[PDB]
Amino acid sequence: RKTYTLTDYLKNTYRLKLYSLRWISDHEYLYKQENNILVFNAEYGNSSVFLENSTFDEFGHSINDYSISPDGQFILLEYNYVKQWRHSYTASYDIYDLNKRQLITEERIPNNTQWVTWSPVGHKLAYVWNNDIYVKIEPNLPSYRITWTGKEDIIYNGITDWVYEEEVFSAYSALWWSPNGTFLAYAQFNDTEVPLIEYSFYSDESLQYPKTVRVPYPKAGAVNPTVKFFVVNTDSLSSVTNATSIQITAPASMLIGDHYLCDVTWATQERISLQWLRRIQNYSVMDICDYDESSGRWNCLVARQHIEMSTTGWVGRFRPSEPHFTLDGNSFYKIISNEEGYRHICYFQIDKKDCTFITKGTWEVIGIEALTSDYLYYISNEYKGMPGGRNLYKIQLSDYTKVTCLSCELNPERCQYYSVSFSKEAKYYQLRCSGPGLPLYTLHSSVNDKGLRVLEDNSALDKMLQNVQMPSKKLDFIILNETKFWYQMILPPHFDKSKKYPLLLDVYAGPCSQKADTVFRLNWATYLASTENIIVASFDGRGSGYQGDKIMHAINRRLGTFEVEDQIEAARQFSKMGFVDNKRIAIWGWSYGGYVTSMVLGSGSGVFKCGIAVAPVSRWEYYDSVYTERYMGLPTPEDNLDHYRNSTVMSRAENFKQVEYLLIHGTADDNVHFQQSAQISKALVDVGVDFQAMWYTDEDHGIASSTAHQHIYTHMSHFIKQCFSLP
Amino acid sequence: RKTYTLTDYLKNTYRLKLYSLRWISDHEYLYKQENNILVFNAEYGNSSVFLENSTFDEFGHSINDYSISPDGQFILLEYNYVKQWRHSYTASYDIYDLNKRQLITEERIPNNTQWVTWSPVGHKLAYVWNNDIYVKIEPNLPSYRITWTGKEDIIYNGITDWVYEEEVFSAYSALWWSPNGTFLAYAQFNDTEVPLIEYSFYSDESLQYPKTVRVPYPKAGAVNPTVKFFVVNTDSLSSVTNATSIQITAPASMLIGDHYLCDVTWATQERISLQWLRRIQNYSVMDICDYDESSGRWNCLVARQHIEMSTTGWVGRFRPSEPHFTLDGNSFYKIISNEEGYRHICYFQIDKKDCTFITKGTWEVIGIEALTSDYLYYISNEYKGMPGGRNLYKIQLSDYTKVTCLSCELNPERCQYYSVSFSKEAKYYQLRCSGPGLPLYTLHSSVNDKGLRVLEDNSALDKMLQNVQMPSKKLDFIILNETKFWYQMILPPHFDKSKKYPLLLDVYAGPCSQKADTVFRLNWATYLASTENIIVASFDGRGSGYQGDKIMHAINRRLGTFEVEDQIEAARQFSKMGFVDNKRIAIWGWSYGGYVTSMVLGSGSGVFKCGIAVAPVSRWEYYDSVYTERYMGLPTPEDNLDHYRNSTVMSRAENFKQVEYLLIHGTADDNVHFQQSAQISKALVDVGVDFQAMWYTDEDHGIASSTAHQHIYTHMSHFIKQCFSLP
Ligand SMILES: *[C@@H]1O[C@H](CO)[C@@H](O[C@@H]2O[C@H](CO)[C@@H](O)[C@H](O)[C@H]2NC(C)=O)[C@H](O)[C@H]1NC(C)=O
Ligand SMILES: *[C@@H]1O[C@H](CO)[C@@H](O[C@@H]2O[C@H](CO)[C@@H](O)[C@H](O)[C@H]2NC(C)=O)[C@H](O)[C@H]1NC(C)=O
Ligand SMILES: COCCN1Cc2c(nc(C)c(CN)c2-c2ccc(Cl)cc2Cl)C1=O
Ligand SMILES: COCCN1Cc2c(nc(C)c(CN)c2-c2ccc(Cl)cc2Cl)C1=O
Ligand SMILES: *[C@@H]1O[C@H](CO)[C@@H](O)[C@H](O)[C@H]1NC(C)=O
Ligand SMILES: *[C@@H]1O[C@H](CO)[C@@H](O)[C@H](O)[C@H]1NC(C)=O
């Protein structure tokens, strides 16, 4: 048998199959197979070809993606896609009339469009072009301009700026149609006084002078963008008069200082829910806003506000949780940290104070996935008390003590990590198992939770892997100070507990992270264990998520302390184990994991021989405001400046004398700026520490272009092999 | 027994002593001893203290340098010095009255002054501040503002812009006093349309956002700065009206296209010499400009212009040569390439055609050093036909065939490389011998060329080095195609030709370079040979200097060809010698040498195991116009674009799979932009070639800060030691 080699990883020789479907109604879904788009009937499994892979053969452009209108009458064709940040991009768009089978050729959606979306019913369109919002009532009719204030890098209507895209909304879009399609809600961001990160972009060899990229980007403590919220009635659009947006003001408790808009959820045709968060992310308010048919205005009764505070840390895992409204819009369910610090499902009634927990226990609800009049469906890590497992549950809304696990026993050896996708109104659901066995996609009907069929079982990959010496994974826990902390180890094939293997500690360790889990992965660690006989371990210490606030908030206002200390202690314990060579322990991480790796290597602990930090944070003052201040507060003498200064990699420079360090960073990293590693190397140079380095010209945080990806893993593999005296 | 170690190099354990003197008249000089300024009488050798080391103890600022006025009455004190590029800087200044022994507190020179200079006689001052020129007649009187057009990065009056500072005048100054101090001539540079190179400067940790540095910098083929020339009468300045600057325009043969002002020399009190050079640097014109008492204008008779052209290359070694005027100003001497392509001294009479060569032979004159009524003094490499030796000669003006060597036989074994400094009117001269033995400084009188006394013989260093196993240096030649090409080897102590040594080829190889010479050096190569037992070789191939145009111009319009090939062939030659291990040959270079090193590693020659390129050029379109176009013409389809494109490092990327490569660059390199290495690394990545790299944050082309310098030589030493399998 051959082994899983670096080339196998880099060339994607062993591929995981997926089953990506889009629910189109309560009983049908779209699935793209062999470039043909199909419609499936969930109950019986029969299908029809909706669009053949030949249709646009003479389109004239490579089609990047498609979006069929809700009523199936039109399809959007996305082409000329050019990526921007994590979510944003620009593209060109054509619209094809499915009824007449022809492209619409006038009043086209413009080129360089920044965002487009169908209404939730029908076929209205909203798009953003040059930072302004436009609406098309019909694909062939001229559009109506909703906003006129948009200016590059300054005013954003209907799309997010850098830090909202990355840290608040996880999306470029800041547009929200009402369930009906009647109203279009949108946010407007103002980056007027936000400072710019500037960095060079070298481009192709032919470019004589490097370009300077400039992005409004608030580092910790700097001026943040401001936000406004508006709602436009899309039924009353006039060809003669500019459209009229109604502003909805943030609560007074937010208007007293810096704040964020952090969630927008339509509750009914005439009720919108808005969540706001103070800049000190301690305090949030949910506003319920009702439409007044006579007034034409939107009002947010103060008495309806729901306030959420934390004294232990910040609000929510990364932000306040999403509300899930009942059909009538009069009550909702939301995940909330309970009195014991565990995140559970809470039932809220509008116009009543407080809430009622419907789940409890020493485990957490991960997400609320569907809600009907009879049941609420949710994913949690309760099963077998493993925080790194995930299963689907349903809870009987008329008796909260009746909770049934829908996924726990379907295939208990192969499947312990589930996610789910329900059709509209929750008639059917697709289950997606991610491990520990090969991913398995199944379809089910909710009425009695019957298994309908297997959609994808990865039998092909399974056959291929029969010919390979694959490594194994152990998931278990150690005890630090009377508490359980979980770890995982990728073990080489034919693991012999009597031998001594080198160990690489793979770290992330950011707040609410989880690197010990039951999911199946084919990655670099697979190669390291399979071919180089290296154990790759990961550990979830203080600050990790899904185990309660006592663990997650331990790190509050003190990044670079307990989570770094805990990675060190985990390695010590692994070294005790009689199968680890304590002379050959390495560490590596990317991003937050680069910071932790650097702090660990700079600790003088003597535990680690060498380490690799990829695109590390080095000083919290250099990273973005929304993320950083959530854990660290503000970098002022009045607040947390002292710990901002005590938690830099640079201050530990001298201790790097005791280790081999490889430092790697993309020069076009718009996220963790090259600046951060530039300051690390200068501190090392100033104190006479030798180290190794590699910049990646024009790569960003992901160092993800095909050639750079191959190059960085090839470079790191040489480094780790050298460090471990492996032939 | 000890060797010359890395730490000795880095920490300067063994220091070379100097004897820097400043002639202040025909028979006296200034010399600093224990920070005491002494004046010495050249004839008799007696001295006295001019300025006590204690004089300025209560000054309140650290004094960076001083400049005494020509008449001994005042001394300028430079403090708050801040370096800019190679020559430019800003500083604060104070003038101390030596007769009153008081600091002058009235009408002070402003802070952030860019350039200052006394008149050549008396005590007038011209300085530049905010890009405008000012003149003080007396140190305690208000200054007269001469120009009003100065503007940062756009209009420079009396100082040079980036490219003129670096490539044209080798100085920040663009002011020239007439011998009398009557006139002040000055250039004005206009950079309005020159593009900017932009790069990040990260600064101290405490700086939250990196700064973008922007410098007007014309890359090859881009818009160059424009230049004007003016002359002001300093004797007729008024406190009422502004100075009247008379413009002298360039010849009409220059005005037809882009051109440079390349040399300014005052011939008499009323005659200025100006040399102009076309942007295509094979055509230059010398103008002789005379003052007209009656009109106050300067007139340049078109008829007495001297024209210089080249068909095989560019004009001059790096630029048209300096004219040396006879006292009366009616004739001059200047170095000119003769009919055989050897650079010799030519005698020109103003208003007469052609010139008369007063020297000849297969060797070159390096510089004209002094001129009296009886003799012209010059440095050449005639002695023993060694192009890398330098000696002082004098030629009898009344009989050109009487040429006397003044330095050749002073100490033939210790001293073969001299420079010289003559007193005012050349009554005395200081000889400075730089090798092959320890530097030796002596004083002589011109009357009969009698040695007066030894000034510094480095006996102290000599006694220390006797305790060290020092390397020897061999200087010799190999014959390629019936031409002699010279090389040097730094050989390890107790060299044994029956042994095999690893060899490092130390490369520069730029046009008119010379890396094989008789100079004594204590450098990185000294450590490599003495401690690590590595032979460090350099070779002067096609394109090299001081050997005639056949060799120097071989590289015309073809950079990255013959000079690269010849380094490879030299390496082959070196292997065929029995004391070289051909499995351990490396190559390294900085700047142009980093370019050549990269081209060599990318040639696929198989000769070199590994190499290091520091701050290399990677393609000629990225480097500056004046230097690049001198050798390469313009990068246009009608001129030389094809060879610009065929001579990049990037196009050889695939071939780097055969070698180990270390690429190093400073991020704030204003000269060879980080961009050049950014593009090399991108090409290697794109093609799947592993290599090593190191950036140096905020270091410029010299990577010369104390900590960076130590870091880079330490890093390179590890790399060579690994590549050579050395303990
Ligand atoms: C975006 O925010 C900026 C800065 O707050 C606003 O700029 C101000 O605009 C008003 C009137 O134009 C005045 O207060 C000042 O003249 C501006 N101050 C600054 C700092 O420039 C700007 O109006 C906002 N733009 C939008 C579309 O809301
Ligand atoms: C420096 O050069 C600039 C650029 O050529 C000169 O600006 C030009 O001046 C003329 C006459 O005023 C205008 O008609 C042009 O439009 C200008 N060109 C540009 C691009 O601005 C400028 O006058 C020069 N400055 C000095 C002091 O010589
Ligand atoms: C290769 O990246 C490692 C995995 N990460 C890191 C990551 C991801 N997503 C988001 C939204 C964020 C928040 N900025 C982050 C993130 C977290 C911390 C720091 Cl210091 C930097 C970053 Cl970028 C993600 O997927
Ligand atoms: C550490 O530098 C190595 C030695 N050099 C290189 C050097 C020096 N002086 C001048 C005026 C120049 C012309 N720009 C150069 C130079 C020549 C070629 C290239 Cl491609 C880059 C450069 Cl910088 C010098 O002293
Ligand atoms: C188009 O679809 C057919 C099946 O209907 C498939 O066999 C063929 O490979 C497809 N062509 C592609 C993938 O472009
Ligand atoms: C499935 O089959 C039924 C019965 O013929 C048919 O009516 C329905 O349209 C089919 N669904 C799809 C998506 O083909």
Ligand SMILES: *[C@@H]1O[C@H](CO)[C@@H](O)[C@H](O)[C@H]1NC(C)=O
């Ligand atoms: C978009 O660009 C394409 C080519 O770049 C051009 O043919 C077309 O006119 C543009 N389309 C629109 C809708 O502006």
Ligand SMILES: *[C@@H]1O[C@H](CO)[C@@H](O)[C@H](O)[C@H]1NC(C)=O
């Ligand atoms: C959708 O809701 C709005 C607000 O209640 C209403 O005015 C409009 O008529 C509705 N649209 C449809 C399709 O009836």
Ligand SMILES: *[C@@H]1O[C@H](CO)[C@@H](O)[C@H](O)[C@H]1NC(C)=O
């Ligand atoms: C346990 O307590 C000790 C002492 O208070 C402390 O050093 C250590 O970090 C703690 N460990 C954990 C993981 O709680």
Ligand SMILES: *[C@@H]1O[C@H](CO)[C@@H](O)[C@H](O)[C@H]1NC(C)=O
């Ligand atoms: C040298 O000595 C002579 C004779 O005393 C004296 O006049 C002269 O000033 C001295 N020069 C110096 C510079 O000490």
Ligand SMILES: *[C@@H]1O[C@H](CO)[C@@H](O)[C@H](O)[C@H]1NC(C)=O
């Ligand atoms: C130079 O700067 C210093 C510090 O601000 C100031 O005190 C001093 O007066 C300045 N000197 C002159 C000549 O303006």
Ligand SMILES: *[C@@H]1O[C@H](CO)[C@@H](O)[C@H](O)[C@H]1NC(C)=O
């Ligand atoms: C210096 O030379 C110029 C030549 O025109 C003359 O006008 C001036 O008088 C001279 N100055 C002195 C100080 O003799």
Ligand SMILES: *[C@@H]1O[C@H](CO)[C@@H](O)[C@H](O)[C@H]1NC(C)=O
């Ligand atoms: C010698 O001549 C041959 C061409 O016939 C060429 O390969 C080689 O480069 C030449 N060497 C030198 C230094 O002239």
